[PDB]
Design an enzyme around this catalytic site. Structure first.
Site, PDB file in Angstrom:
ATOM      1  N   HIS A 169      18.780   8.692 -11.792  1.00  0.00           N
ATOM      2  CA  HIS A 169      19.622   8.652 -12.902  1.00  0.00           C
ATOM      3  C   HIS A 169      20.215   9.948 -13.068  1.00  0.00           C
ATOM      4  O   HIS A 169      19.895  11.093 -13.083  1.00  0.00           O
ATOM      5  CB  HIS A 169      18.495   8.624 -14.429  1.00  0.00           C
ATOM      6  CG  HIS A 169      19.063   8.731 -15.430  1.00  0.00           C
ATOM      7  ND1 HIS A 169      20.633   8.445 -15.614  1.00  0.00           N
ATOM      8  CD2 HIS A 169      18.727   8.673 -16.693  1.00  0.00           C
ATOM      9  CE1 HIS A 169      20.680   8.380 -17.108  1.00  0.00           C
ATOM     10  NE2 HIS A 169      19.545   8.398 -17.642  1.00  0.00           N
ATOM     11  N   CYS A 191      23.566  11.150 -21.311  1.00  0.00           N
ATOM     12  CA  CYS A 191      23.586  10.156 -20.195  1.00  0.00           C
ATOM     13  C   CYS A 191      24.825   9.324 -20.367  1.00  0.00           C
ATOM     14  O   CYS A 191      25.317   8.536 -19.571  1.00  0.00           O
ATOM     15  CB  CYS A 191      22.291   9.104 -20.354  1.00  0.00           C
ATOM     16  SG  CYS A 191      20.853   9.872 -20.744  1.00  0.00           S
ATOM     17  N   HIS A 240      22.509   0.293 -18.214  1.00  0.00           N
ATOM     18  CA  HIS A 240      22.253   1.700 -18.384  1.00  0.00           C
ATOM     19  C   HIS A 240      20.932   1.612 -17.764  1.00  0.00           C
ATOM     20  O   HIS A 240      20.663   2.811 -16.815  1.00  0.00           O
ATOM     21  CB  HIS A 240      22.140   1.901 -20.095  1.00  0.00           C
ATOM     22  CG  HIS A 240      21.372   3.079 -20.235  1.00  0.00           C
ATOM     23  ND1 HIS A 240      21.824   4.570 -19.325  1.00  0.00           N
ATOM     24  CD2 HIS A 240      20.203   3.442 -20.798  1.00  0.00           C
ATOM     25  CE1 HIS A 240      21.279   5.522 -19.787  1.00  0.00           C
ATOM     26  NE2 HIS A 240      20.023   4.887 -20.702  1.00  0.00           N
TER      27      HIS A 240
END
Ligand SMILES: [Ca+2]
Ligand SMILES: [Ca+2]
Lengths: 896, 823
Positions: B373, B198, B333
């Site tokens: 995401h 990520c 995030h």
């Protein structure tokens, strides 16, 4: 007048200006010095083909010029279903051979805490990174516990493998598949296991991967993003698919060999492997006295760009990358003597590389003084993602051994290379790496298939106690058994290494696990024998073993300080002639007080005047040694004379205060009249008390000590004492008269009790820090100890040792260390407590050498889980960190 | 005569400066000069992405039927084995579409070419175009490529269908993907593919910023890509209890129960600030500082860690020399996990608690609430969002925040979630934000981004690799010219001529205003041929043609000879500043026209000229100085052959003559009025056309540029030249013989072109003037330039606009001619 002032100001103005200029200069120099700072390589480890499992094994292979290339193992895939040398064949592999590892399924899952479920979907690349990194750190002589929670960087050359694509075939996708196969999880797991918080990344630039990771790690260290770095690469040959792609792309030699620089170069051979190196900035490695294997001076990474094909090399690209790397470390091309070439052994590659080398080093090198080239690729193949780490490691070993290893397969020099106009020479024999004083510098090249080139420049690295204690430990009995074996081969192969150095390294630079062994030895041969004795199971003195339960804490430790009758001539003389923490205490005492030293240790006695203060000092000196090795009492106690030292230790006095008091009573009780006797009686305190009453001797005889349930000491006037003894013998009760001067803890101690209460009055009494068991009570001393009354009452009252022991047993104490010249209180102690209970340890013992007793006891504390200050234990000695065996991984097969 | 103190204070001033300078470049802001993307919700540009964010649009949808059958992998039951928790995701509108010929990828090569590589090529091409990088400055340059990219499933679905091919390697290896970017774009600086989960896109950024500061490269491409090709990964992530069964990132909300997988690609162009300013580049924002770290052993391998997040944010601030108080916004995030969200806010509160208040709070949000995401490309979306926020000075809303999470101590955390599109109100001070990305396996990254610092006749050039693409390009300029009438044609032309690749299918348009250009482009799309519109398809690998410069002689001169160029064109003025007057006057004008043509990148392969024209062709060749060169009876025109006229001179015994041979039926006779008048009367009696106006009867170094002599009529003294005839017809035949087809005339009237066409075969060659009396000086020069461009002549478009106030503007990007490739 005021003329002084304008001149004082002018001097102070210049003074400040020079201070400011100095500091400004320093600030900028630090910035420049830091930017071009060499990066010390402090440890390495690997798994390479040909059974190579360490740098030593890689060097033997390289040294002996061995071709590690073999046929695809039957257990990987059937090469018979894919081999076809025909260039026109479709979906086939050009070669029968490759560079393979001995095993890839084997992994010590419990060591790393990987459950057997998780390991099934765990990429063999992750398994190898864990084992290799662990060993790289051990070899760099760092302890992973002191490395735990640190700013350490991880930079790995790693691409995905075909492991997951072998799981997707047989099973249904699971949660572990992700962490088990992602290259980001691979590097992530290292930081997780070793507790590293610095930068962490997985790089992929094909063949240059391993060298790109090095460049990034060196960037991080110079930029101060970490203080330690792991840098490496992995590459595995799990499926024939990639081998079909590379054969179809015409990259692979039908011979299954890298014939670098030879006329017959017709492609490469695919090899596999793993290499990890430990990096520090040089200044930090010099400050920490780390062994620098070699230094990385400069690095560069670039791209081929549009100049030629995507999969075709480019000479001007290679020239720019070597030159930039030389520029990055401030190395002149003339300084370079060796190149570990990309040298894949392709038809067009070999001429482009040598031509690019010729371009860089042509004006600096001659045909009489040529640059030497070669590659590990001619031994182990092209490890692709891990090539470069293998190259770097080869160069590092070459620098260590001051020899250049031979490059294999060089028979006919390539006619397409203009050998006569390029000052290049192929290493064909193991030769001394000669120089003319000049520091050995080398380059390592890796030119990625998709045009991502990398180059690295590595320089040569810059420039008492005769009884020893060795500790070993592993996570399992099998692992400790394998570890003991490693040591036996290690000690037989390297006899030139000092037992002092080996021991120091194992105790300070190795993890202390639950399956442990402690060995006391004075020489290498004795150590070797004891290891053999332990292996055969021959229960011998000086060798202790245990398996501590998982998550166990250091036990509470009781310190028992010896009494009066313990003295002997030269008691602990060896520790005076050999131990500095003991000496800085025993001489400090001596300053307070003929001299303590002349009485204790003469050129070439039992009298209470000497007897009393000596023991105090000797016990303080022994206590100073034990605390220096990390031993801190949880409770203290001592038999009268020893309750003095027990109290100084808890705080009550200063070494001076306490030692003044013990010298006072010693001098006092000496001048006291004769006719004083003391008898050791094997009878209960009540039986002796009924006899005192029966014989009406209560005012003339006293009980001096209660040392057991059926062991007491009577004290009083000679006739009366003899009368009670004769009567006790008449009763079949055993008696032993003591070789004593005066009748201690008896009424006869009343005259002195005022002249000594006078001395005690002129003393400051600070409260105790550690728990102390009262001799007067046999219970935990309260605030009672503060007043000089407690100390005057102490002489008159019986020593309740038996009750003191039962107090300790009731508080759950099972570890007792006797600070004294004889294990007296231990013997009495073992009698008070139930049979087989507790661990009893002396400091000194007649018949046992001082160091021998001290170390045998230390090894036994290390078996209890007591955290020993091993740094402290070898501080006053000339010890050096040496190379010692790494962890023996307990391997088991995991796949499917 | 300086004292010790004076000397020290002088040496100190220097030492301080040397230190300040070094410290400055080590912490130098890195300018963001262009970006492009492919995000869910049909987003294919930073503009379309800002509409999505602006209007608080939710771009999540069910898995497309052509990706995988969701019905076969979905199960609501959170106890279901080998199933996907949700049936949704953030998807790209198309992933199989690619302009392979543009990139020079065969159809066999494209079959196995991973879609990630396809998007990376398109996206990088657009990013560079938007950054307005001059093509010649990019090709064969020290430019870095730092991309967050992990392998996709593409090859897995290839393996199920065929025998392995060579292309499978370079078409699927993540190194090959970044490698190809350098290969196609001609980049030689550092190149690397990073995979930190990520945080990949933020790690790639940090690496790029370091490389730029370390002077490893002078420009860098940074970004990442993530694509959802197979259900397998979504199964793994569902089994690992990571995915929201709602299929939504409900960041900071009480119901937060996992994330939703998204796909996309983002590339940004980076330059050190001092270089972006020096080059007048448009700075979208500056990257102040960056930091990468690890969770270590603290929490669990897949569980986040507050202390690690505090360390990373603080490191990024320190690295950039930013005060936490300056930070007004955070691109969280915020993946919407149950435990992740409290940890994250907690960590924000720890870094900013003592600097922000409940009354004046820190604003937080995430693009994940809009697109999901994006994982490996997660950091690039977040960054792009913040950059867009700084540009438009607004904070976009964050979706799904209905119930604030009770596990977050909102009352103590000076943190506020962005719920509405709000003006990014700063109290005078610069707008600073940060973007966080915490990798699933502990690798953390945080980046700190700050707001960016602080003649009338035109020729537009348009070009594409294909005819279909050029029409699509013209169509986009039509729409563009309508939507932005606020934009000056000078700047639009400037950007399009200097900041765009010049391809085979081209278009040149001369226009004096915006209205003229819109109309001319409309006329072209129809085929209504009008003056000032040029079009051609140059063949594949067709080099620049041979240009022959022709300089006029006597007779061509006029009173207002290039006045418009004397005043408006400064290059022409520079060179500038009756036989005794006209002869050096024509030289003066022909030097000024040539210098002006040369400033546009024109260089002859051959030179020649009529009478005075030969003397000016000589200076140009470099045979003598300009200083040396410039310092220096009736004539009748005959419509008959050079042979046919010479026989009559012998017949009438008039020998002691021919002045110039301008053709095989066009010659000039020189002599005395009586002698020439006797010829003219005899020649008119033979029915041969004749006319005449000349007030007389006419006729150092080596050459670096080939010259055709008037005397020889061939390749090549000055004394004999005055006597001997001007063999113009012979000079033209040699040009034709040596393959010359492109003719440029330097002079006031197009005399030599009319003369030349008569000397060569029908319709052979291209004939170009400089000045034509009826035509405007700028109009004739620009129409000639447009025709030189059509021939393939590399025109120096920057020299063409060197003396005018021209600014780079946001111009359209390449219309990729997409086709479907798969397997
Ligand atoms: Ca190449
Ligand atoms: Ca974690």
């Amino acid at each position: 007048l005021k003329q002084e002032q304008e001149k004082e100001q002018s001097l102070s103005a210049l003074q400040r200006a020079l201070i400011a200029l100095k500091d400004a200069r320093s600030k900028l120099e630090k910035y420049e010095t830091q930017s071009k700072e060499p990066i010390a390589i402090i440890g390495m480890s690997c798994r390479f083909p040909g059974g190579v499992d360490s740098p030593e094994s890689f060097w033997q292979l390289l040294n002996d010029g061995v071709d590690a290339i073999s046929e695809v193992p039957s257990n990987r895939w059937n090469i018979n279903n894919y081999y076809d040398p025909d260039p026109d064949a479709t979906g086939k592999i050009s070669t029968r051979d490759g560079g393979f590892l001995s095993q890839i399924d084997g992994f010590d899952a419990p060591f790393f805490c990987i459950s057997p479920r998780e390991v099934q979907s765990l990429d063999p690349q992750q398994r190898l990174l864990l084992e290799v990194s662990w060993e790289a750190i051990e070899r760099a002589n760092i302890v992973p516990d002191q490395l735990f929670n640190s700013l350490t960087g991880v930079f790995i050359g790693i691409g995905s493998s075909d492991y997951l694509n072998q799981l997707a075939t047989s099973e249904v996708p699971q949660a572990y598949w992700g962490t088990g196969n992602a290259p980001s999880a691979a590097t992530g797991r290292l930081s997780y296991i070793l507790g590293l918080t610095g930068p962490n990344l997985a790089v992929e630039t094909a063949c240059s991967s391993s060298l790109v990771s090095l460049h990034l790690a060196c960037q991080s260290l110079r930029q101060q993003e970490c203080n330690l770095a792991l840098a490496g690469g992995v590459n595995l040959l799990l499926s024939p698919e990639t081998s079909i792609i590379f054969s179809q792309a015409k990259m692979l030699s039908p011979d299954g060999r890298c014939k670098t620089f030879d006329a017959s170069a017709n492609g490469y051979v695919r090899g596999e492997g793993c290499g990890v190196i430990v990096l520090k900035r040089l200044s930090d490695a010099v400050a920490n006295g780390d062994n620098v294997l070699a230094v990385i001076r400069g690095t560069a990474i670039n791209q081929d760009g549009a100049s030629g094909g995507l999969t075709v090399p480019n000479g001007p690209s290679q020239v720019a990358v070597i030159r930039k790397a030389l520029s990055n470390g401030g190395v002149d091309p003339a300084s370079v003597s060796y190149i570990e070439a990309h040298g894949t052994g392709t038809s067009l590659g070999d001429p482009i590389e040598v031509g690019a080398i010729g371009t860089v080093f042509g004006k600096t090198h001659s045909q009489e003084q040529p640059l030497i080239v070669g590659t590990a690729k001619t031994n182990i193949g092209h490890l692709e993602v891990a090539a470069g780490i293998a190259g770097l490691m080869k160069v590092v070993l070459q620098l260590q051994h001051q020899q250049i290893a031979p490059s294999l397969h060089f028979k006919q020099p390539n006619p397409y290379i203009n050998w006569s106009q390029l000052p290049v020479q192929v290493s064909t024999q193991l030769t001394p790496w000669q120089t003319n004083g000049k520091s050995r510098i080398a380059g390592v090249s890796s030119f990625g298939f998709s045009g991502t080139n990398a180059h690295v420049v590595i320089e040569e690295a810059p420039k008492e106690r005769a009884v020893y204690l060795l500790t070993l430990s592993a996570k399992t009995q099998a692992a400790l058994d394998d570890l003991v074996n490693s040591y036996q081969n290690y000690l037989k192969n390297y006899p030139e290494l000092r037992i002092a150095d080996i021991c120091y390294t194992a105790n300070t630079c190795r993890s202390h696990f639950n399956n442990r062994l402690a060995v006391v030895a004075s020489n290498q041969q004795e150590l070797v024998e004891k290891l053999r004795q332990h292996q055969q199971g021959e229960e011998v003195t000086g060798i202790y073993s245990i398996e501590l339960p998982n998550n166990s804490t250091a036990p509470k430790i009781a310190l028992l300080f010896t009494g009066q009758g313990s003295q002997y001539v030269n008691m602990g003389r060896q520790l005076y002639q050999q131990a500095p923490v003991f000496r800085k205490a025993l001489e400090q005492c001596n300053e307070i007080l003929k001299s303590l030293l002349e009485i204790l240790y003469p050129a070439n006695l039992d009298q209470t005047a000497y007897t009393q203060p000596c023991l105090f000092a000797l016990e303080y000196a022994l206590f100073k040694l034990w605390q220096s090795w990390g031993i801190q009492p949880d409770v203290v106690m001592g038999h009268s004379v020893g309750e003095y030292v027990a109290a100084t230790v808890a705080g009550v006095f200063s070494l001076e205060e306490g030692l003044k008091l013990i010298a006072a009573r010693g001098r006092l009780m000496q001048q006291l009249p004769a006719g004083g006797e003391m008898v050791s009686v094997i009878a209960s305190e009540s039986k002796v008390l009924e006899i005192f009453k029966a014989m009406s001797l209560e005012e003339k005889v006293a009980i001096a000590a209660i040392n057991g349930p059926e062991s007491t000491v009577i004290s009083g006037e000679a006739e009366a004492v003899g009368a009670i003894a004769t009567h006790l013998e008449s009763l079949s009760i055993k008696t032993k008269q003591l070789q004593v001067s005066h009748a201690f803890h008896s009424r006869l101690m009343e005259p002195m009790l005022a002249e000594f209460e006078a001395v005690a009055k002129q003393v400051t009494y600070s409260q105790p820090q550690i728990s102390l068991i009262s001799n007067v009570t046999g219970q935990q001393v309260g605030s009672e100890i503060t007043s000089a009354e407690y100390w005057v009452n102490h002489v008159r009252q019986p020593v309740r040792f038996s009750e003191s022991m039962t107090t300790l047993h009731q508080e759950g104490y099972e570890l007792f260390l006797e600070i004294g010249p004889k294990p007296i209180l231990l013997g009495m102690g073992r009698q008070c407590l139930p049979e087989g209970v507790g661990v009893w340890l002396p400091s000194l013992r007649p018949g046992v050498e001082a160091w021998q007793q001290m170390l045998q006891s230390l090894g036994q504390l290390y078996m209890k889980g007591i955290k020993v200050n091993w740094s402290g234990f070898d501080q006053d000695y000339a010890c050096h960190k040496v190379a010692i065996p790494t962890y023996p991984f307990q391997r088991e097969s995991y796949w499917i």
